[PDB]
Design a protein around this ligand. Structure first.
Ligand SMILES: Nc1nc(O)c(Br)c(-c2ccccc2)n1
Ligand SMILES: Nc1nc(O)c(Br)c(-c2ccccc2)n1
Ligand SMILES: Nc1nc(O)c(Br)c(-c2ccccc2)n1
Ligand SMILES: Nc1nc(O)c(Br)c(-c2ccccc2)n1
Ligand SMILES: Nc1nc(O)c(Br)c(-c2ccccc2)n1
Ligand SMILES: Nc1nc(O)c(Br)c(-c2ccccc2)n1
Ligand SMILES: Nc1nc(O)c(Br)c(-c2ccccc2)n1
Ligand SMILES: Nc1nc(O)c(Br)c(-c2ccccc2)n1
Lengths: 121, 121, 121, 121, 121, 121, 121, 121
């Protein structure tokens, strides 16, 4: 089963980070969310009720990305992966990629980040 | 067998969507189609008749992407995957990725979508 | 005097547009704001008080771009140009470029928009 | 008067060109249209009737770009500039930039083209 | 063994294609070549003689991409995969992706192509 | 008279440069050529003989960019501007922008270059 | 005289800014430098001594962009414009564009900045 | 276990290369580093001490990419993979992709490079 529903390059301005200054000023966090979901019934029926509604997923991600400031991107992706799995039984697994394109790192790079894959139990 | 024939970033202006307004105004749907096909005979012969003609595939995709408006992207990719497999025996499998780069979703993202992989029976 | 302070590609999700559906669903409006301001005193002094603070300008633009939905982009740029000139005497002139990259227009383009230049009186 | 209404990167697949093969196969023509129009009344009124409707302009461009195949891009831009000026009195001047990003030219470039500016009489 | 040596987005202007007009005018063919090669000895030694020289590979690809015009991209990738495997014993496998970003296909897409993976015997 | 014929982002691999190593290894030189030419007769007639043929211009640029290695980009643009003006009476003026995106300069930048504008006498 | 020597998109990680946190963490500052210089003698002679050496200019910019942290971008561009004019008599005028693509501004934009043009006296 | 910590498109100006001229002039080396690390404890705890600190990783990469000039990119990636594994027990495996976007190769391509994956023992 290789079907997926995705949300690419979602961007939020938040205040997460392990450095004090980071939390004060803030920055843009890029988010990629890919969900493993069987889409053949929805492909057959065309009924939005036989699949997972991405608008709702974006809201879940947004509320976490734009909410209380935490330390790690690991903590943000885990809160997201655990929030999507809990609310949707159709999501057999959730992958969250979070990117800090502009962290307090003296250098020239395209970005730094983490990525987790969490199956739904 | 890892050979593939692909059509990348095909773009169509259509009226699909589960929201009334969506169907009225319309939007651009991005499409990525990758077909699993053995290309060694065509690689040996150079005869366009020993492989799958992509122009014809683009027509198949286009006619569905620019035809009657449906609800789900799941329904569009399923109609496409099922239309390419049916007409081409050389396509051992069909993967369809459909992206809504500008859905009625209040936010900043690069796009939302679904992706299905359907083997040919 | 060719000095300028600029804000490029600001993006807001708003509900402006002359079509009903437009106001319902909404879309992303891209904004470019360039202000004619003499920057030599600020260049000499280094005091943020001898120049125009762009953060404040972004707020002005944001509040208009993300506020009550109007019809024309012409009305949005005029409200912005008139709001920046009124509040800042240092701005000898204000240019506002507003782009609708994804309007309800059946076609393939990079975007449509308007641009106004309004001197401060 | 520096106000403008623009349509950027419009793209059409057409069969224009001075070479036989060109007209047979065809290619993508990129089009940039910028109109000099006073937008202060529309900025004050917010009435779409005090400005020029870009949707209609896109249609004018499209119908020429996707119609009978001609030789020169000079002929296409002249037909467009002359068609927008004729139908709109508010357009004090029309600039048409047409780009052939992939002409039958053995080389590596981003594109070739022409650009004309035609005032409305 | 997941080590690889790659050549990305190589571009050549050639006259391949199954349509007469195609061979007359020509077009740009994009090429991606990834070779499976054990790079630990070269990583340990730093001697260019313990790895595969990419300059030579580019020459091999170039000479085929810019040589006699064939029909299929399948034939070009097969000639390339077979030419790199034959000349280099260190290449355990060769993957060739060929893209026609601007084929004689009436539409809007990013490109069409094929991709083959050929192990070295 | 604001009409223009352009050739954008032409790219050539050459050995120009004031440093010995530069001439040995070589690099990619980006070239932008914009010609001031009255295009109304060509716009009226559609005859390729009432305008300037860009294919020929690309050849002129290419032959200089890919020929004998010189020192300055100033010398390359001057040879180009002087070669286009001499051969074409319709070109009222020639602008040549040459960019070295990857010069032997220890740093992070998008590119360095020169640009000249030479009227035809 | 429209000749110019340019340095585009130079990027430096520095600690400038009017906010304490800004100076602590730091960020990437993008710089565009365009110099008005007569390039015909250099175009005729090909001698690097009849024009302005951009490598040296990059060093001047770098040393200021990567040196002591100041408040305004206005102060950085003024120090740069004044440092290039002073050291080079051939530079009839200097334009400095400085961009903060990621300032401490809660929002979605491509960047904010200033631009100054300073003639050489 | 599919969790990963990544550093994308890091860029350094170095003097590596097998050609004399290469080491003299130098060039920009692009680096992609992806580390296999279990991030669930860090996702649960939010303590930066239960995961791998990317800033430190960037320093490790930087010091090698900007240090003594070697011959092969294979030698640079091996030094990096071996330096990250040695210092971090949490990194179950290290993948290093090094790209030479502008090597002394007469042609038009996006880049050439190598990629290694080294598990931590
Ligand atoms: N792995 C990881 N995840 C995060 O979310 C942060 Br913030 C850091 C980190 C902490 C301090 C300095 C640099 C990076 N490291
Ligand atoms: N999964 C899925 N596939 C589609 O094609 C649509 Br439209 C939606 C959807 C429906 C309503 C609101 C938001 C998204 N969701
Ligand atoms: N000039 C202009 N400015 C705007 O803001 C809009 Br919305 C429209 C318009 C109105 C109806 C259809 C198409 C475009 N036209
Ligand atoms: N100026 C100009 N405008 C056009 O539209 C074409 Br097609 C050509 C042309 C004709 C023949 C060969 C190359 C270019 N030249
Ligand atoms: N599979 C495949 N490989 C190629 O190289 C070509 Br050309 C075509 C093809 C042939 C005719 C029309 C459209 C595509 N099809
Ligand atoms: N102005 C200018 N034009 C060129 O073409 C070169 Br090469 C250089 C130059 C010479 C030496 C070092 C750095 C730049 N400078
Ligand atoms: N004009 C200008 N130039 C700068 O260099 C800075 Br920093 C600011 C500024 C200061 C405080 C808040 C927001 C912007 N404003
Ligand atoms: N495989 C490999 N790795 C490197 O790091 C270099 Br430099 C070269 C190489 C050597 C000489 C000419 C062309 C490429 N080849």
């Amino acid at each position: 089963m290789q079907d997926t529903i995705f949300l690419k390059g979602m961007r939020f301005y938040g205040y997460h980070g392990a450095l004090s200054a980071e939390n004060e000023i803030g920055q843009i966090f890029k988010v990629d969310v890919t969900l493993k979901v069987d889409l053949s019934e929805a492909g057959r029926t065309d009924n939005v009720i036989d699949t997972v509604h991405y608008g709702e997923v974006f809201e879940e991600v947004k509320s976490i990305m734009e909410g209380k400031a935490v330390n790690l991107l690991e903590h943000l992706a885990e809160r997201i992966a655990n929030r999507i799995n809990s609310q949707y039984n159709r999501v057999m697994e959730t992958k969250v990629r979070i990117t800090k394109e502009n962290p307090p790192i003296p250098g020239h790079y395209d970005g730094v980040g983490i990525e987790i894959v969490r199956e739904n139990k």
